[PDB]
Design a protein around this ligand. Structure first.
Ligand SMILES: [Mg+2]
Lengths: 69, 136, 244, 386, 42, 455, 42
RNA sequence: UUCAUCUAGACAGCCGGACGGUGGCCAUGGAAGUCGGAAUCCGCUAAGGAGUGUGUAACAACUCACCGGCCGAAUGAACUA
RNA sequence: GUGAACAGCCUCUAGUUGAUAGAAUAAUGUAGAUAAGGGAAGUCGGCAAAAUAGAUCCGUAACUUCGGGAUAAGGAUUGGC
RNA sequence: GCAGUCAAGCGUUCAGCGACAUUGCUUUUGAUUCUUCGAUGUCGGCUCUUCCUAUCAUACCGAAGCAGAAUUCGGUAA
RNA sequence: GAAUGUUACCGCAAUAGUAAUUGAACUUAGUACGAGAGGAACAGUUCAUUCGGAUAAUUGGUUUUUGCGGCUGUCUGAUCA
């Protein structure tokens, strides 16, 4: 059900906004969905978002955004 | 009887249903064994499998060495704590039920067994008797 | 000499039998194949008695004795004691023992001259054992193994211990027992040497699973074969190195 | 719907209907095949269940884990005083089953069987078989003619016997009358043996012996109307279910619109005739043999009567049969001993028993002593003693 | 020995009418589809 | 796994496999559904049928894939044997085709289930189920040749030898019919043809023997010719790669007689050519059929070839004959000694003593005078086992333990202990010289009686 | 496992019956006949 | 119903031949007709097919298509109802 | 009187014997109970039962608006003379 | 499923129809599968009876490289 | 349960139902089979899972035998009861 809902929202969203945890954004990246988004639906922007930045050092978040941008 | 067990086993009271916890009776480091299944148990609707003295069961180590956690290993019951009719003409029971972890061949892991060992289990398991310092 | 034998389907010869220099005990379980197997080596030279202890076939572990006497646990019924005495000559002492422990065969490892006992064995039991068997008694453990009667085999010719015995422990125990000791395995790597076989000054019986190197090691250490009082063990060094 | 789960049914459909037995004394449905070569012998006997007791015996059974061991097991004690033949019945094989040809009585029926023919015995004038007994007059041709007729046509011969109720500690004075088939060849010899046994008594020792396998048939314990939960072992409902919880919740379905005979509903439990076979006889005690409860080991001058007497039974003074296990029917109930109907000499039966010790302690309460002498020796002298 | 069930031979006139209608349709279909010597014997 | 991969599950051809799967799907699953049933019921029924068919096909393919030894990264010797026998390229291609067919079946089943979940009519669902079944059938039919080839290769691999390269083993090399099969038969118990025709053994033969309590296995090979390896048969390549990969010590056999018409010069040339394979094997030369040649009666010019062979450091010459098998024992001992010495040398790359801290071993005179038992002697002992056999055998004969137990007089041997007497069991009171204690008690009673104790 | 209606088991049981099994019952009946005759002789 | 063989011995039953160039050409450890690839040429017959099948490492041997010898007369093949 | 208590029970003054009964104690029910070994493995779901319950003493955490948590929690006694 | 080849046969009067087979379809080196995309409608469970074989096991057999053990299919079998 | 002269006893059986099920311990066996790994089967025995029928020998549970003994409150003046 959860994966079906994910696919439904992906198909029903012109743009997809991906949230990430500042503690471990790379682990939460879940590249599996992103590959399908890039391949089947190029028009979907698939924009990242670094959430929970208030729970990490400012330099940590700055480095994360610099390396992921 | 199953593999490892030698000879036939006469039925006795089943005082260890699935999910029961019994104190470990071997020096392998385990504290208590949580029974998840009983080897050789019967199949019947709504009837929970139950073990008895001398029976081989699969149980997980609920407490003890971390290395023994999360894995289920075969075990042999050495004490039952439920009165059973001995053919000699006496009903006897142990202070507390206990078991010893063993391999499918019945070989003992611990080098020694603590506390009394039931006569039926010792007779049915040569390795248990060899590793048992006290019988009954 | 060393001969391969098996119980019904168990290689633990010492569990269901107890062989001494003057008498042998076997279980009554199943048939006389075990009795006939023992007869094929001993024949009628010494008594062979079918006997049970506490109504079990494990009399080997429950009882310990030598040429001078035999010891049985408190759980033994008077009928079994009387049958054993009548089947044995008066030269072999028989007496019941009363103590917390019951596995005399596993609690006591002894020969006709020296005896090993469990460290926690009571004073009265130790004195009774010494008086009955006419043997010296020492408190010892085989490299930390408290079950001296199960993990070690002893005889007037030699003794065998489980492979985990430390070299220093083996050296100390050999000097204490005044007999050679060798660390080996029986029944294809089984660590319970004292339960997997029985041995005396002139006969050794082991499980069928005993591989050829193990049988040769047993023969060399226990000095069964003629002109082989561990002398041929030197040649076995290369074979053991290649196998190990 | 396939029930999603296969499980065995509750109860045996072959024992239906689960109704009360026709009479207190169950009638034997079949008798052992007649061996023409064997001599004439009695195929069954009538006894009264005296009670139960504990027996310990060294078990001789090669291949068993209990070889040369004293296994304790339960046995049943049945009071079986000598029985007396008071007639014979001849049967002729007809295309519509065996048919009774004629019956002959031995000129003298005991008062016990006379009571059996009257309900109000005391009110009755006691006009007993006297008239038929007069058929044994000077010539007695009628009796001889009937015997010859039985010889000519009867295919099987069944003797009429009644238990000596007066020899039983039962409060009743009326005895039970039943037929017993006669085995052996020379059907003429059967009736000759019956005639020679007319008015004579036959002891159990001449019918059964130690180690002999027998089948016991008797009316089971009655319990009256019983719930389906215990009458069939039906699973109890969880709790406080509507219309109760100790009953079968589902009785039918859309089709068929009728309750099946196999739904195992509640009804009468017990008091049903049952047949139990392969009961091993352990002890055959003579009535006049003192120390009936003494084995070769105990050898103590004590009878098998438990201290204070059997619970709900008397002080057995005559021959009795001891058989292992249990037999259906309550104490004071008449139980018929029947042969195995076949060669049941399996090693279980071929093995010879040897009782090490016989339990004779009081079954009334937690009796600890076997005989009053032991109780006096243990407790010693009391205040009332001196 | 434990013979299984046997098919019933009853007419079941519902089947009579069904087969009659089916045959009537089939004859019409065949008719519509229709539009679209051995010499001396030995 | 290794060591006789005999437990591979048999695989039926494409037609048989498809028929079995279809029959199983038709039988196990229900087949009765009606148009009056709800569309959901029909959809569920057809989806269940398709899923069952797909699961059966997937299980079959997975079993076939798992059963095979996975030739890659098994062992150089076993891998090379499989490559030479089953054409490793073709074997891998066929197994990859089976794996691809499994994935195709999975994808087809999933797609058809997804399509059928939207079914709107009984006919549509039936057509979708039939389409899925037909797709699976076509995929299976495309697997015709690989399944047939894999059945044969599975049979062969199950029937192939199982040698342990890490163990100490012998290897026989030389021209065909030189006596390799005869030597293998004589040295160890094995079933090998010993006929004199060109290629007696078409594959490797294994035979086990024990020396000095150590397990040894001898390996016989068809042999090799003087070919430069540019052109060679799989039979010769098997022997070549067995020599190359195996640590076994190789013995080069030779026949100097007119038989084996490759002359002594040819044998020596073959030995020199194979020398590179002989570098680390600690080789030994065995001259067979010595009964008819006796190389001591050989020309010096011909013995020059033997000397040149001996020029190699680790080679040695041995003499043996098929009829005179006694030399087989000597050759076996020499080979075992060489192998053991080499292994002991490579490996490196004890008992206790009393020390004195009297006690001596004890043996009864009866044992010393006891005679050895002979199972085949008609006059041997009674064999209480045989006594039980003549009385009904095990489980029937009842052993009377009272027969042998010793008592002061056999006239009361078959007696019974009362064990009980109105309490205070007999065994408790059992003690010799009861008369003395009874007399003492009687004296005490006499004293009490005259003392007036009992008033 | 084999049921009572197993032909091989029934044949084995029949052979056993012809063995000492039936002889034991014959001896038991012979012994019982002596006591039956004694019941009248007394 | 339509085609075939037939006292110039019909079908089926028993015994003999089934040759010689020849072990025909490619590969071959072995490939003689019968593991595989192109040929599948010619002599004597009543007949022999570089071989219908079984089997040998290799032939060998057995056997078949046909023919020949014994009895004798209807028999065989494909279809329709 | 017991008892912290107008908490529960007995008795004293006073007021009642009024609820159709008799004979057994079948199944199934209404209300209240006991249980060998396992202790939620049953059920959608700890549904219902059970468990600690008063007094005295030791001692009492995270959080917090500093007021609370708190009888936190976790432990030892209770009779008579 | 669609698009093609062949015809054992049928046959506008024997051009057309057409059985069994057959080619294209939906990464060749067991490598991966980290797709798993809309059922507009319920299914799933406590007690309990019967019935079908399209047989999971027990019973009796045949065929499988069935040396044994062990495994596959098939015949009867509720 | 009336009715077949009445009561009582002993019976036959048309008909309806039916049942037992499976596993393992020896022997035969470390034997046929095997290069080794390993591992048969029948006959005789002995136990065991599930189901069915009985009975409390012995053990457990159940107590209105309220049978015995003890305990709190309260009442019979105290004790016993
Ligand atoms: Mg050869």
């Amino acid at each position: 059900r959860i994966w079906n809902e994910l696919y439904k929202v992906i198909d029903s969203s012109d743009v997809v906004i991906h949230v990430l945890d500042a503690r471990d954004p790379l682990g939460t990246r879940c590249k599996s969905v992103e590959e399908y988004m890039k391949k089947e639906t190029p028009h979907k922007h698939l924009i990242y978002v670094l959430n929970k930045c208030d729970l990490v050092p400012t330099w940590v978040a700055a480095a994360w955004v610099k390396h992921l941008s | 009887s199953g593999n490892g067990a030698q000879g036939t086993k006469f039925r006795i009271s089943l005082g260890l249903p699935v999910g029961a916890i019994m104190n470990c009776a071997d020096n392998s480091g385990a504290r208590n064994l949580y029974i998840i299944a009983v080897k050789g148990s019967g199949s019947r609707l709504n009837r929970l499998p139950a073990a008895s003295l001398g029976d081989m069961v699969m149980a997980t180590v609920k407490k003890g060495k971390p290395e023994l956690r999360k894995k289920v290993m075969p075990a042999i019951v050495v004490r039952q704590a439920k009165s059973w009719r001995r053919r000699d003409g006496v009903f006897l029971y142990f202070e507390d039920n206990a078991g010893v972890i063993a391999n499918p061949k019945g070989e003992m892991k611990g080098s020694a067994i603590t506390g009394p060992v039931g006569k039926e289990c010792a007779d049915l398991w040569p390795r248990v008797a060899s590793n048992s310092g006290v019988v009954v | 000499m060393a001969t391969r034998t098996q119980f019904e389907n168990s290689n633990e010869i010492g569990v269901f039998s107890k062989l001494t220099n003057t008498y042998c005990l076997v279980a009554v379980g199943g048939s006389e194949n075990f009795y006939s197997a023992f007869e094929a080596e001993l024949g009628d030279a010494i008594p062979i008695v079918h006997t049970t202890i506490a109504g079990t076939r494990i009399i080997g572990r429950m009882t310990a004795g030598n040429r001078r006497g035999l010891l049985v646990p408190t759980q033994t019924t008077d009928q079994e004691l009387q049958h054993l005495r009548n089947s044995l000559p008066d030269s072999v002492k028989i007496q019941r023992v009363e103590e917390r422990l019951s596995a005399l065969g596993n609690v006591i490892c002894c020969n006709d001259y020296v005896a090993l006992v469990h460290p926690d064995i009571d004073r009265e039991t130790e004195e009774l054992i010494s008086d009955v068997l006419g043997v010296e008694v020492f408190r010892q453990t085989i490299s930390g193994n408290i079950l001296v009667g199960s993990y070690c085999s002893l005889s007037n010719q030699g003794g065998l211990v489980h492979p985990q015995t430390s070299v220093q422990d083996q050296e100390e125990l050999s000097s204490l027992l005044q007999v050679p000791l060798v660390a080996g395995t029986v029944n294809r790597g089984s660590s319970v040497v004292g339960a997997g076989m029985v041995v005396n000054d002139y006969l050794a019986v082991t499980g069928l699973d005993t591989t050829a190197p193990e049988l040769s090691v047993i023969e060399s250490i226990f000095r069964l074969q003629d002109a082989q009082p561990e002398s041929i063990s030197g040649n076995l060094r290369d074979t053991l190195i290649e196998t190990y | 719907s396939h029930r999603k789960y296969e499980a065995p049914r509750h109860g045996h459909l072959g024992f239906l209907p689960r109704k009360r037995a026709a009479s207190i004394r169950a009638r034997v449905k079949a008798f052992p095949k007649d061996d023409r070569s064997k001599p004439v012998a009695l195929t069954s006997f009538l006894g009264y269940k005296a009670g139960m007791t504990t027996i310990v015996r060294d078990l001789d059974r090669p291949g068993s884990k209990f070889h040369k061991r004293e296994v304790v097991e339960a046995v049943t004690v049945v009071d079986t005083p000598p029985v007396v033949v008071v007639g014979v019945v001849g049967y002729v094989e007809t295309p519509r089953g065996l048919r009774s040809l004629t019956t002959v009585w031995a000129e003298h029926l005991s008062d016990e069987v006379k009571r059996r023919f009257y309900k109000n015995w005391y009110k009755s004038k006691k006009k007993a078989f006297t008239k038929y007994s007069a058929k044994y007059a000077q010539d007695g041709a009628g009796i001889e003619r009937e015997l010859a007729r039985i010889k000519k046509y009867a295919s099987v011969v069944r003797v009429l016997v009644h238990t000596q109720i007066r020899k039983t500690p039962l409060a009743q004075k009326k005895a039970h009358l039943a037929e017993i088939q006669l085995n052996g060849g020379s059907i003429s010899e059967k009736v000759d043996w019956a005639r020679e046994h007319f008015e004579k008594t036959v002891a159990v020792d001449s019918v059964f012996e130690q180690n002999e396998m027998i089948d016991a048939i008797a009316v089971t314990k009655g319990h009256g109307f019983e719930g389906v939960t215990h009458r069939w072992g039906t699973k109890k409902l969880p709790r406080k279910t509507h219309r109760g919880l100790r009953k079968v919740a589902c009785i039918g379905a859309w089709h068929p619109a009728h309750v099946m005979w196999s739904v195992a509903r509640a009804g009468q439990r017990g008091y049903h005739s049952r047949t139990s076979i392969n009961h091993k006889i352990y002890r055959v005690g003579k009535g006049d043999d003192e120390a009936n409860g003494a084995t070769s080991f105990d050898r103590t001058k004590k009878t098998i009567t438990p201290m204070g007497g059997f619970v709900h039974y008397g002080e057995i003074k005559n021959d009795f049969i001891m058989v292992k296990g249990c037999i259906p029917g309550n104490r004071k109930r008449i139980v018929t001993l029947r042969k195995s109907l076949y060669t049941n000499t399996s090693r279980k039966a071929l093995e010879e028993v040897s009782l090490k010790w016989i339990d004779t302690a009081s079954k009334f309460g937690k009796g600890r002593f076997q005989t009053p002498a032991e109780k006096h020796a243990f407790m010693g002298t009391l205040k009332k003693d001196l | 020995m434990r013979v299984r069930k046997r098919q019933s031979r009853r007419t079941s006139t519902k089947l009579k009418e069904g087969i009659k209608k089916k045959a009537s349709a089939h004859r019409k279909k065949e008719k519509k589809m229709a539009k679209k010597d051995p010499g001396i014997p030995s | 796994m290794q060591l006789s991969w005999k437990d591979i599950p048999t695989v039926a051809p494409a037609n048989d496999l498809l028929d079995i799967v279809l029959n199983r799907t038709q039988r196990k699953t229900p087949t009765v559904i009606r148009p009056g049933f709800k569309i959901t019921r029909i959809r569920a029924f057809y989806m269940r049928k398709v899923k069952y068919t797909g699961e059966g096909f997937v299980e079959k393919f997975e079993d076939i894939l798992k059963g095979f030894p996975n030739i890659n990264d098994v062992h150089p010797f076993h891998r090379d044997l499989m490559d030479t026998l089953y054409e490793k390229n073709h074997y891998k291609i066929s197994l990859a085709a089976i794996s691809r067919a499994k994935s195709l079946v999975e994808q087809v089943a999933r797609d058809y289930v997804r399509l059928l979940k939207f079914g709107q009519s009984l006919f549509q669902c039936k057509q979708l189920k039939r389409a899925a079944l037909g797709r699976m059938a076509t995929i299976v039919k495309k697997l015709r040749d690989p399944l047939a080839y894999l059945e044969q290769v599975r049979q062969h691999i199950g029937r192939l030898p199982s040698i342990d390269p890490n163990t100490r083993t012998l290897l026989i090399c030389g021209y065909p019919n030189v006596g390799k099969s005869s030597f293998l038969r004589c040295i160890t118990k094995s079933d090998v043809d010993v006929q004199p025709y060109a290629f007696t053994t078409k594959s490797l033969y294994v035979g086990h023997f024990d020396y000095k309590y150590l397990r040894f296995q001898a390996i016989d090979t068809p042999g090799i010719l003087d070919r430069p390896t540019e052109e060679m048969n799989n039979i010769e390549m098997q022997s070549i790669y067995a020599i190359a990969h195996l640590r076994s010590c190789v013995l080069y056999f030779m026949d100097l007689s007119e038989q084996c018409g490759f002359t002594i010069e040819a044998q020596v040339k073959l030995f020199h050519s194979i020398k590179p394979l002989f570098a680390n094997k600690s080789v030994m030369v065995v001259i067979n059929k010595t009964d008819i040649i006796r190389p001591e009666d050989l020309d010096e010019e011909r013995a020059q070839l033997l000397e040149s062979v001996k020029e190699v450091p680790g080679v040695e010459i041995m003499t043996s004959s098929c009829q005179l098998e006694e030399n087989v024992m000597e050759v076996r001992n020499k080979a075992c000694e060489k192998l053991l010495a080499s292994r002991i040398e490579n490996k490196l790359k004890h008992v206790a003593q009393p020390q004195a801290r009297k006690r001596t071993p004890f043996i009864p005179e009866s044992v010393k005078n006891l005679k050895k038992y002979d199972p085949e002697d008609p006059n041997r002992r009674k064999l209480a086992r045989d006594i039980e056999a003549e009385n009904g055998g095990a489980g029937v004969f009842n052993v009377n333990l009272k027969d042998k137990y010793l008592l002061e007089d056999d006239e009361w041997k078959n007696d019974i202990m009362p064990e009980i007497l109105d309490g205070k069991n007999v065994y408790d009171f059992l003690d010799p010289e009861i008369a003395a204690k009874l007399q003492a008690l009687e004296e005490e009673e006499e004293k009490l009686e005259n003392e007036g104790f009992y008033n | 496992a084999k049921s009572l209606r197993a032909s091989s088991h029934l044949n084995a049981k029949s052979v056993k019956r012809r063995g000492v099994f039936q002889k034991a019952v014959d001896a038991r009946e012979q012994r019982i006949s002596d006591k039956l005759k004694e019941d009248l002789l007394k």
